[PDB]
Amino acid sequence: KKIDDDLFEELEEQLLIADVGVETTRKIITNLTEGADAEALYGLLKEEMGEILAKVDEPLNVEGKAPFVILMVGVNGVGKTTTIGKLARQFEQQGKSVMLAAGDTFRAAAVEQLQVWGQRNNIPVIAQHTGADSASVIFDAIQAAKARNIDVLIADTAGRLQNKSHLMEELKKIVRVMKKLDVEAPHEVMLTIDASTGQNAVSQAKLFHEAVGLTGITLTKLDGTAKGGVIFSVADQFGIPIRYIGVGERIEDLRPFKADDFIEALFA
C-alpha cells in the first residue's frame, strides 16, 4: 500500500476515534507529514507517538517517607475510590504499610465503601461523619499515619466539579493544611481520569493541574472500547507522568503504565 491523501485522512479518522483530540491529532499529522509505503508510515507514527509518551513514563516511587502522601484528585465517576484500593493493595504487596483517608466526606457510599474494604483487608481507614470537613479528615489521617509509622497514606477527595462546589479552593486548602504537618506533602498529586470520558479529561487535567499541580495520572477503564488517546494531549500540554492504567473492576486490575503496549493497543 502506498502513501497518499487517503491514508492521512484514514489516520486522522483513526486518531480522532481514539480521542486523541482535534488539536493533538492535527499537530501529530502535520509532524507525521513533515517527518515523512503505508506500513512505513504507521511505523513512523508509532515512533513519534512513542516520543510523546516517553516524556511522561516515569513510574511512581513511594519509598522513603513517613508517610509518603498521595492526594487523589479527580471528578466523581472516574474510578477514584476503586483506584485507591487497587493502589493500597499494590503497596502492601511491596511490603509497605498503608493508611487511607476518606476525604470525600459528603459521599456516604464512597466513604463506607473504603471503610469496609479497609476493614476486610486490615488497612486503617480514617473517616468522620458524613459531611465532615475534608481538610480536617485528611489532617487527622496524616497525624495518625505519622503516629503509626505508616509508609503510604492515600487521601481521597471530593469530586463534584461545579461553581457551587468550590472544589479547587477546597483542594488548595487541603494542601496548605497538609504542609503545616509536612512541607513535602502531598508527595504525589495523582489525577484519576476515565478513558471513557475522552477529551473531557483534558479540561479536568487543566483544572486540577492549575489548582494544586499534578505529579501523576492514573488512566482508568482502558478495558472498555475507549482507547485513552487523551493522554497525548495531556502529555503535550502538561507533561504529567502517566503512573498507572486501570484495566478492570477487580482489585488486581491496576497496571504500571507502559508506552509500547499503550501505543499498540491504540491501533488494535
Measured from the CB of residue 3, what is the shortest distance to ligand GDP in angstroms?
Answer: 37
- Which of 223, 252, 261, 264 binds ligand GDP (CB under 6 A)? It is 223
Binding residues for ligand GDP, how many (CB under 6 A)? 18
Q: Does 24 bind ligand GDP (CB under 6 A)?
A: no
Q: Which is nearer to ligand GDP, 26 or 89 (CB)?
A: 89
Site string for ligand GDP, 104-123 (x = CB under 6 A): ------x-------------
Helix, coil or strand: residue 31? helix
Q: Does 248 bind ligand GDP (CB under 6 A)?
A: yes
Distance (Å, whole) CA 255 – CA 218: 9
Measured from the CB of residue 249, what is the shortest distance to ligand GDP in angstroms?
Answer: 3
Q: Does 247 bind ligand GDP (CB under 6 A)?
A: yes
Q: Does 221 bind ligand GDP (CB under 6 A)?
A: yes
- Which of 47, 169, 184, 249 binds ligand GDP (CB under 6 A)? It is 249
Residues forming beta bridges with residue 69, ordered by sequence position: 153
Q: Which stretch binds ligand GDP (CB under 6 A): 71-79, 128-136, 207-215, 257-265?
A: 71-79
Distance (Å, whole) CA 183 – CA 206: 24
Q: Which three cell numbers stand for residue 113?
A: 465503601
Q: Does 198 bind ligand GDP (CB under 6 A)?
A: no
CA 69 centroid distance within chain: 15
Distance (Å, whole) CA 249 – CA 241: 23
Helix, coil or strand: residue 81? helix
Measured from the CB of residue 104, what is the shortest distance to ligand GDP in angstroms?
Answer: 7
Q: Does 165 bind ligand GDP (CB under 6 A)?
A: no
Instruction: Name which of 85, 200, 232, 217 is nearest 152 in CA terms.
Output: 85
Q: Strand ranges (DSSP E) for the chain?
A: 68-73, 98-101, 125-126, 152-155, 188-194, 216-220, 242-246, 254-256
- Which of 15, 52, 68, 79 binds ligand GDP (CB under 6 A)? It is 79
Measured from the CB of residue 82, what is the shortest distance to ligand GDP in angstroms?
Answer: 4
Pairing of strands 242-246, 254-256: antiparallel
Q: Is 80 annotated as a binding residue?
A: yes
Q: Which three cell numbers stand for residue 144?
A: 495518625
Distance (Å, whole) CA 266 – CA 15: 9
Question: Which residues are part of a known binding site for GTP?
Answer: 74-81, 156-160, 220-223
Residues of this chain that bind ligand GDP (CB under 6 A): 76-82, 110, 159, 220-221, 223-224, 246-249, 253
What residues are designated binding site? Answer: 74-81, 156-160, 220-223
